A paper describes a structure:
Certain bacterial species from genera such as Paracoccus, Pseudomonas, and Alcaligenes have evolved to use DMF as a sole carbon and nitrogen source for growth via degradation by a dimethylformamidase (DMFase). We show that DMFase from Paracoccus sp. strain DMF is a halophilic and thermostable enzyme comprising a multimeric complex of the α2β2 or (α2β2)2 type.
We noted that the salt concentration in the buffer shifts the oligomer (dimer/tetramer) equilibrium. In the presence of low salt, the enzyme is predominantly in the dimeric form, and this equilibrium shifted to the tetramer at higher salt concentrations (≥200 mm). The local resolution plot of both maps showed that much of the reconstruction was resolved between 2.5–3.5 Å. The high quality of the maps allowed de novo tracing of polypeptide chains of both the large and small subunits. The mononuclear Fe atom is tetra‐coordinated with the protein. It is coordinated to two phenolates of tyrosine residues (Y399 and Y440 serve as monodentate ligands), and a glutamic acid carboxylate side chain (E521 serves as a bidentate ligand).
Author numbering:
A (entry chain A), C (entry chain C): 1 to 762
B (entry chain B), D (entry chain D): 8 to 131
E (entry chain E): 156 to 310
Write the structure that this text describes.
């Protein structure tokens, strides 16, 4: 069909004046040129019942023609130990020990530990071939020598594997031993497992210098060109404590290494401890320490999961910062990606007279037309507007390259209909290697994706994209608010949640009112602190969304383009495995905000109540609508009207996500309840956070928790928070050509908050 | 003595087959006892301001929780102009598209509903 | 109507031969006598479709007439500081400071801190009256002097409260100050809270010796008779760091005390640190340490919750053993009971020739008949039979004095019918002070009950009790199995789960086969270790039940009759507050076994899948039933029949709790799936642990997880494990006068497991 | 300035009254449009081997989740001989029993069902 | 032996070399303490007439490069004496607000860093027995100790 022929991304989400942003572009093949120009995004939704797509051209130094070329992506987690001087290719006898835990032991050939060239079969490796651990040496002639284990591995069982090369006997040996205990494996000690072997073979050849790096969980593709080794046969599952010896080990040495004893410490050529670097702040680094004392330090590539349960993990401690000796594993999936690592094609330095708004680079290739969005800040330390719009870039990363309808069996069940998918949803399915996975997707192992990255082509971030749950989801849903603010005469600035994480409440206090996106679901702990500190002293805000502070996020300290989330039972897609709840960026718990005594009620007045994606409802006015203290809100609205019966997103104003009033979760006591939503269906459900025992009938129309709630409270020093508690509020702003109750209410509150008089103090 | 994992298998598939058989028989008995739910679905496949009947919702609850390999969806060939019906394949594969084109997406949802009823009738 | 006139408990659940059990009986009023005699429990269910009630009298030295009397029960949590020398009634100036966190601040008069006599109004106290903190002294002549706060207390807000008595100005003073932070209280920092006040009043009287003990969270009733002080005006909510001074404090000093600074350390008279004693194994003690060096050590009474979040808790650490300085609180519910502390009426020493079985002491008062069930063991180190029946006494404590149908609003919705309730539930509803609460109950605060005790009259432990979900629930549901074993020729011993906790796998290895109860839901970690050590080495077991290893329990070491459970999301009645998931008896996580990588599939083959209580289903055979390796199980059973269509519990053999085969949770690889249950209704639901997103249709007959699964696997050394995966299995043994498929299958497996040959090795 | 907690109340009660009014009108409309669910519940009030209709189940889903102050239950006066309908009161109180006795608990369940329908009619 | 926080800024938009100096003494880190009324804070600027070019040397902490690197080896001539802590290079121009936040140890603008060498990255329970200096910005510009500087020094 209309296939995607050009891809691209930018290196950073937001850029102030006088700063450089770099744009990395890739084509299907190296031919032709492509065009590029700068646009200002105004509206994104191409629904014929609305305004249609809107953009504006901007003259810049950025535009021109550039050569189109294919750029290759490395895809899959591994550890790369750079060995320039062939020290880890030993000249005589050498032994390799490691602990293993395989999740897909029959998914092709999977290299475990290797200094191995695979173009010419030179070096040594340790790999899984047809479910069996194989230890192979070679010398580049094509002639190799292997030893194959008698016992095929089981899935998710800890094994202790030793490979031995011995020239004195001209012999390859292999030791295998399962080290199951009560908690570390898939099944426990009641199973009479027999997976111990000790096999030998005749090494007719000698191992040669492979001219590659050493790789944990992979094999090297060819000889290194310009110092880069390419990884090919990716392993899935935990590796714990690998080490290389300069001698040949016996069976008593293998038996002692299976119990965790370090035998012959003077003979270790290398020993990588994956738990070295854990303090009370976690392990926020890609650095892998050589514990032998020879400086063969490694580097984690494409972010394998650190702080993972080891081979000796009994469950007496479930926090990896208090028992680092039982957390020496790294998970290593084959479909991870933290950086595409492409070569830059062009870059942009922001001029002085460039307004702070949403921007995109429009790349015009042969028939494919691609966008690359970015965000432009005001000059550093200054504000150029009274209104601040927060772009929800952390939630853009959470839903980045989302593949629910192609992967999740409950995709159509959460929706209330069959999904409608673009060619972008076909392009993600056809080329998974170019893009990666979302945090709502899982790996090929089964565990969900914790880490997501900005430095990759994110295809559901383009403004002409329409998502599968309904109409539109993340950035075109914020272009609704942008188009409403441009149709009226409001002057605004744009910040991101990464900028909020960097700058604190000092960013927010430059503005009289701060607005959120349509779905600001993922926040850091410092963003919640900044919002609370802003509102506690005269700050005003509008929360024009639902599901607004649900999951705790930490931005990675060494790599600020990578986001971490670990999830638990709640409104979730996956659940974290039992001892692995704590983040590795900071050493803290970080599940739901509500489970850390920081529910969304304690800051924004309302918080997560229900979800469902068939259609939307409308709001019905509560008795606080006729209160004299909120006559400024309900100003041009008859007291018997439906608020928001019609809209682009879902067909109404109350829908897709609902937040409610709750004093026990932390609503301020002076909050008024202006309206509440009705006409919700069986597809909407009560969230698992609110259930004790699941009984029948906890769904829309049949349970009191299924509602959205328009609220308002006031804070000290003339501040106040307004909330509408629905995603599809912003999709109802441009209904009936901007002549509706939704835009009247939002405009009344926004004209009140941009004044100099205090917020009206309910 | 447990030593080779190819000697063993997931024996819950022997019950998933047994469950699917009873469940497909129940669904075609619902569709035969209440023929009006098909026209109810054709009038409004979203249930917008007229929520679906419990029998139509039971048919939806069967159809929507299936495994994704083999599942039908709608491919927006030209948005608001043309819609086709696709079938999900493995990673790395383009989907198999349908012949017929549809104007709105509600027509495509009802054709997916009819084709799923035909495919559950075909296996029995 | 029919009121209960006589009660009773025993000191310990299980007693071996040559050992002593004490009995504690209370009548409604002191008049007359009562009779007592020993019986053997055989069958408890009085359903006319079954065998009817059965028992057997035993001649013993226990029987006779005993004087009836009313025994008063102290009910509610408090800390008691014994002061005979009146050291904590000072003669001159004194001040009191504490941190306050009140859950029901407008519920009666609640004494916070006191050394007070309430008959004659003497001493001093600090109490909540009319929602306001009042500090009052009194001389013992009816004349009191008070000082009342200007600001009422908000609900669940942390306060810093100083009460000062200054004789130099003849002035009672009081200081109140809220100490909220981002996480410790009900609402957060955006609320412009104004509950700070400094008030004063004239003091006309002097405080006198109240001749009571000092009490945290309560007032003393009268003067101490025989050394025991009674507590009347019980507080609800957290108290943190109480201290008494020998001087008069100013507003500067109270302001420094609100920041946690210990002002004037030489002037302290007492200072109780509630976090003194937290090691790496929790705080398993009632001793409260005086941190002022004066030896005024305290004592917890009726088990207040140790390990509670304190006034300065920010959620960076959520385990009290790693940050003990932010966990200095106790919760002090007004309706806690760890021991009724009655007087012994009669005792019993188990004779030399008494069989190990279920026993009870039948008490025969005027028109009332109460039983006191206990358990008789074989002699220490010997086993008198090849069968061990485990009585599930931990699960009996969990459901002890269950009041779900009177308190929980969703109690009928979890069932599928209107509950039928006896006079015992009416007696629990009428006299709450005598009996206590279950762990499926919440407190009056709303937080669920974490501690349950054996030394109290447990009314649903009696065999003629019928429960609200259906027919019968815990001990008559095990009398089903006892009646089936006595009807056949099988010879068994009886042990409890407390004995299994004490004795390990050394208890289990004296037997050929061990049988579980009908619902062995609450287990300790060591019991799961004992079962895994028994099955891993030649042991045989039958799991004639479901929901069998769900929650982690710890027995209190200093008080072996008290059980602890803290709960999370899942199949729960309540969820623990955000910083308090770790037990106080040992400092370990311990919620669901499934979240600790110790699911029930790893040991017993099947694990918790579904629940619902309207009626039961029957089983349909699977293609492993026609296998030749398990033809001994399906011996006299036709391959076209239903298994268990009819029975006393629900009308079928698959019902009320369903367990399934699941390899991912840890089912052994050589497990055969023999049969599965059908005909479950919309009442039966999928558990929250198997849900990612809630969608419509996850209930019986619309989801694959709603099934029970009869399984069998074999272990090493001739062992094996049989599982029926349903509570209502034992209710179907006595159907059609013991002539049905359920009893035939159970008799086949039990005749195989008592032979000397190994288990048949699937 | 927030200084007195008696000046503030739970404002979700103002929506709970609205929701309960809508929901009672809905339940009496379902009982009037389908009168056979009453005789269905009179035949088999447990649903034993004949599961309830979805409208009968929707009426059950309204009735079973109410707050327990004022909730009806069945009191076993004599087990398998006499059953009475009781009303839940505060802690420390006896239940308010009905005058009529019943032989089987199925008759008591249907009588509780009819009395709940009479109460939800009498409030309108 | 007084601890200072030193930011050198090259701003082409104003054609301006800037420099920020600030003493960060506490009760224990320096030669004298907090009773000394120290005044060594300054913010100066100068015009930049030239642009910086590729020196064709390695980067050096505590020294200057002598000539262009011959056979890959860079020689060091103007040796510094004393402690250096947390050196970092940015891709933008910093203000006085940013240098003031950097003096408190806050890592301002983490996405704009070009390199950031953490001299304490690698301290375990067995010391730091290595010459490898870790780039804590994710760009792989890893360092190397030469002639054994004292690792484990007070910061
Ligand atoms: Fe979400
Ligand atoms: Fe239970």
């Amino acid at each position: 069909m209309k296939d995607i022929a050009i891809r691209g991304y930018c290196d950073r989400p937001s850029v102030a004046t006088g700063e450089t942003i770099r744009f990395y572009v890739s084509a299907n093949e190296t031919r032709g040129t492509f065009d590029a120009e700068l646009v200002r995004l105004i509206h994104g939704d191409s629904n014929p019942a609305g305004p249609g797509y809107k953009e504006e051209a901007i003259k810049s130094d950025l535009e021109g023609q550039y050569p189109a070329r294919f750029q290759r992506t490395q895809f899959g987690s591994y550890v790369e130990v750079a060995d320039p001087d062939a020290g880890l290719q030993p000249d005589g006898a050498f032994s390799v020990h490691l602990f293993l835990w395989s999740t897909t032991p029959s998914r092709g050939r999977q290299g475990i530990a290797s200094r191995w060239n695979d173009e010419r079969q030179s070096g040594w490796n340790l790999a899984i071939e047809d479910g069996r651990v194989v230890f192979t040496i070679g010398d580049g002639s094509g002639a190799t020598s292997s030893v194959v284990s008698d016992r095929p591995l089981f899935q998710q069982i800890w094994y202790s594997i030793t490979g031995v090369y011995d020239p004195e006997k001209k012999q390859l040996r292999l030791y295998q031993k399962s080290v199951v205990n009560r908690t570390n494996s898939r099944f426990g000690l009641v199973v009479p497992l027999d997976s111990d072997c000790a096999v030998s073979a005749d090494a007719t050849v000698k191992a040669a210098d492979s001219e590659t790096s050493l790789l944990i969980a992979g094999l090297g593709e060819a000889a290194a060109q310009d110092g880069r080794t390419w990884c090919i046969a990716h392993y899935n599952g935990k590796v714990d404590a690998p080490k290389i010896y300069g001698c040949a080990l016996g069976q008593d040495d293998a038996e002692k290494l299976s119990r965790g004893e370090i035998v012959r410490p003077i003979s270790r050529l290398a020993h990588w401890d994956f738990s070295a670097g854990i303090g009370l702040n976690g392990i926020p680094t890609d650095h892998v320490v050589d514990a032998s004392g020879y400086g063969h330090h490694g580097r984690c590539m494409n972010q394998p999961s650190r702080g993972s349960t080891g081979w000796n993990w009994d469950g007496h401690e479930e926090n990896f910062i208090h028992c680092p000796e039982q957390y020496g594993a790294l998970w290593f999936h084959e479909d991870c990606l933290d950086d595409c690592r492409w070569e830059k094609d062009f870059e942009f330095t922001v001029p002085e007279g460039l307004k702070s708004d949403f921007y995109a680079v429009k790349i015009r290739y042969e028939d494919t037309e691609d966008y690359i969005p970015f965000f432009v800040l005001p000059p550093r330390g200054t504000a150029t507007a009274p209104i601040l719009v927060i772009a929800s870039t952390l939630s853009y990363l959470a839903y980045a390259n989302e593949q629910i309808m192609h992967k999740a069996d409950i995709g159509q069940a959460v929706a209330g209909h069959t999904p409608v998918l673009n060619e972008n949803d076909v392009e993600l399915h056809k080329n998974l290697s170019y893009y990666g996975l979302s945090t709502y997707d899982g790996h090929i192992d089964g565990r969900g994706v914790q880490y997501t990255s900005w430095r990759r082509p994110i295809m559901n971030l383009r403004p002409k994209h329409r998502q599968g749950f309904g109409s539109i989801w993340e950035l075109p849903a914020d272009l609704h608010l942008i188009d409403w603010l441009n149709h009226n005469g409001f002057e605004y600035d744009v910040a991101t949640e990464h900028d909020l994480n960097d700058q604190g409440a000092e960013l927010l206090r430059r503005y009289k009112v701060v607005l959120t996106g349509s779905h600001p679901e993922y926040q850091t702990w410092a963003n919640a602190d900044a919002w609370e500190d802003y509102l506690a002293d005269g700050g005003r805000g509008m929360y024009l969304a639902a599901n607004g502070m649900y999951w705790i996020v930490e931005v990675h300290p060494e790599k600020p383009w990578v986001m971490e989330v670990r999830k638990e039972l709640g409104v979730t897609a996956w659940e974290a495995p039992p001892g692995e709840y704590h983040y590795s960026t900071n050493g803290r718990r970080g599940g739901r905000f509500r489970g850390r005594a920081r529910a969304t009620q304690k800051i924004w007045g309302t918080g997560m109540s229900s979800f469902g994606f068939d259609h939307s409802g409308y709001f019905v006015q509560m008795p606080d609508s006729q209160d004299e203290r909120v006559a400024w809100i309900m100003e041009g609205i008859d007291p018997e009207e439906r608020i928001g019966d019609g809209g682009l997103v879902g067909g109404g104003a109350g829908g897709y996500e609902l937040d409610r009033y709750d004093l026990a979760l932390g609503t301020p006591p002076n909050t008024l309840l202006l309206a509440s939503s009705v006409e919700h269906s069986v597809v909407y459900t009560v969230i698992p956070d609110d259930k004790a025992f699941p009984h029948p009938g906890m769904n829309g129309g049949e349970h009191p928790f299924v509602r959205a709630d328009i609220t308002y409270f006031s804070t000290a020093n003339g501040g106040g928070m307004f909330a509408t508690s629905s995603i599809s509020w912003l999709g109802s702003l441009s209904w009936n050509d901007y002549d509706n109750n939704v835009s009247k209410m939002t405009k009344n509150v926004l004209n009140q908050f941009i004044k100099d008089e205090p917020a009206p103090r309910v | 003595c447990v030593r080779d994992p190819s000697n063993y298998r997931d024996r819950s598939a022997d019950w998933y087959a047994f469950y699917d058989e009873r469940r497909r028989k129940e669904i075609i008995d619902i569709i035969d006892e209440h023929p009006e739910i098909v026209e109810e679905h054709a009038a409004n496949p979203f249930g917008y301001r007229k929520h679906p009947s419990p029998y139509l919702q039971r048919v939806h609850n069967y159809f929507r929780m299936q495994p994704t390999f083999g599942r039908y969806y709608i491919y927006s060939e030209r948005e608001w102009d043309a819609y086709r019906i696709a079938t999900i394949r493995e990673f790395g594969e383009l989907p198999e598209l349908g012949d017929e084109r549809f104007k709105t997406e509600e027509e495509a949802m009802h054709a997916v509903f009819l084709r799923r009823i035909e495919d559950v009738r075909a296996e029995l």
